[PDB]
Amino acid sequence: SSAPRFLTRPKAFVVSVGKDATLSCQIVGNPTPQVSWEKDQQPVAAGARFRLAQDGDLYRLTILDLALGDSGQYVCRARNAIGEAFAAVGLQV
């Protein structure tokens, strides 16, 4: 039915170092897209450092206890049966 597309490009929300940080975006598609994240071409492994979640068309990566080591180019990949959509965001803590 529809290839994935970003309604909102990935945007970072930072409070401070030591507090959680969120890279979030709005993605549409039919079938609904699968979202994957990669920091500096290295894929994000969910767990202690990162947490992935999605409320409807809102997809969000949470970086727990933000550190200077979390700085880098994060690439969001929305994939489905029809296509792929890529968009990136540079995080500088």
Partner: protein, 97 residues
């Protein structure tokens, strides 16, 4: 006046044959810079009847490659330019079976 800057463009991206590819990249610069997508020294032209499409706003560029074919694989260069300077960045698009 403000010189242009490519915000964040992926280094490498991969897609399977026959699918649609979308690469959205944000940019800065006043006056609004000339967006130029190129591959192997050849400028990508947004052909309405073709497979390749480029959707440009005042702050965002989007590369569209419909029904991706093996030949489309390569090193794509996004290049902005205005009265006050220029910036370039590369995305290595890979094609798979």
């Amino acid at each position: 006046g403000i010189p242009p800057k490519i915000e964040a463009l992926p280094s490498d991206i991969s897609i399977d044959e026959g699918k649609v590819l979308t690469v959205a990249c944000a940019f800065t610069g006043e006056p609004t810079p000339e967006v130029t997508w190129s591959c192997g020294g050849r400028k990508i032209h947004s052909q309405e009847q073709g497979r390749f499409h480029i959707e440009n706003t005042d702050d965002l560029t989007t590369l569209i490659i419909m029904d991706v074919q093996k030949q489309d694989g390569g090193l794509y260069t996004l290049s902005l330019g205005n009265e006050f300077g220029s910036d370039s960045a590369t995305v290595n698009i890979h094609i798979r079976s």
